[PDB]
């Protein structure tokens, strides 16, 4: 069945990525979430030049990542209305440096953005660095990132794909791995945030 | 300027957004980026040049430092008004643009910010292309 993970404000998955390093020229991250709360960082990966940072950022979907040598920011929301409203909304986040031509998508429910340009110089996507879930240590200074709440809420079939490795984090986190930690304690499941 | 041929598509069921933008070095050091967007549906759409430091927010408003700035503008607009058959006002909105902005070349990180207000979704974009240069 799914993999799902509520997260309490003091929890977090950490994936270390140091001994299999990925790297691609595109990459998929997908994910849902369910929340009630304004601000919380769903997943943050890359601590060097490139790296993808996706949120709630005062009740709208954020996404912050590098993409080359160049950066991109989105702010996503409903109109008279908020993602945080106890319902599960899918994201999807696409990057693609193929020919250079550098292409990012990111669609949230019924909204879609698919942006792009030619780029001669090419470099590789992904990092050796953790892959956080839900949340990130204190103390961690996580390039690209504009909250540093944890996320309270609910993740579902938090996944990474790119052209080597599909990486399914919830289960992952679910059933175990030794590359996956899990600071605190999680119920692998969605509980009534409400 | 480590890019060129920029594009970018939204969409929604109530509206749907199309940019390219284009760069001219005219080798005088001046640049000119040319955006032409086209969009179908319901809402406001503009798509600029601004500095690294534009805060990416959403809102409802429509020099020396940054060294880029229009200098032509040409918007056409099309709406067509029919009585809402769910409820006898809805409309259609087909909007074309075209926009020469010209740039002073002794700066070059720049960046393209997007926004895009319908009625079921809203959305702003910043995209600073060469920002790791």
């Given at each position: 069945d799914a993999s799902i993970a509520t997260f309490k404000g003091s929890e977090y998955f950490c994936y270390d990525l140091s001994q299999n390093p990925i790297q691609s020229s595109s990459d998929e991250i997908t994910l849902s979430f369910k929340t009630l709360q304004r601000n919380g960082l769903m997943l943050h990966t890359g601590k060097s030049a490139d790296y993808v940072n996706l949120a709630l950022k005062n009740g709208a979907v954020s996404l912050v990542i590098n993409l080359g040598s160049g950066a991109f920011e989105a702010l996503v929301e409903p109109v008279n209305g908020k993602?945080?409203?106890?319902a599960w909304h899918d994201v999807k986040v696409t990057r693609n440096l193929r020919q250079g031509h550098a292409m990012v998508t990111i669609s949230v429910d019924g909204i879609l953005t698919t942006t792009g340009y030619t780029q001669e110089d090419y470099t590789m996507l992904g990092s050796d660095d953790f892959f956080y879930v839900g949340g990130s240590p204190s103390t961690a200074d996580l390039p690209g990132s504009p909250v540093s709440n944890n996320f309270m809420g609910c993740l579902k079939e938090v996944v990474y794909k790119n052209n080597d490795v599909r990486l399914e984090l919830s289960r992952l986190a679910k059933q175990?791995?030794?590359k996956m930690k899990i600071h605190g304690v999680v119920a692998f499941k969605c509980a009534a945030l409400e | 300027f480590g890019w060129g041929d920029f594009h970018s598509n939204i969409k929604t069921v109530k509206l749907n957004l199309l940019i390219t933008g284009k760069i001219v070095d005219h080798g005088d050091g001046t640049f000119s980026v040319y955006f032409r967007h086209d969009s179908t549906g319901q809402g406001d759409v503009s798509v600029s040049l601004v500095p690294p430091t534009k805060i990416v927010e959403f809102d409802l408003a429509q020099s020396k430092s940054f060294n880029c700035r229009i200098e032509y503008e040409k918007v056409d607009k099309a709406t067509k008004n029919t009585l809402c058959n769910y409820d006898p006002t809805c409309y259609q909105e087909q909007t074309q643009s075209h926009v020469s902005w010209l740039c002073s070349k002794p700066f070059k990180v720049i960046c393209i910010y997007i926004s895009f207000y319908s009625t079921d979704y809203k959305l702003v974009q910043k995209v600073c292309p060469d920002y790791n240069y």
């Open positions: 993602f945080n409203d106890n175990g791995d030794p | -």
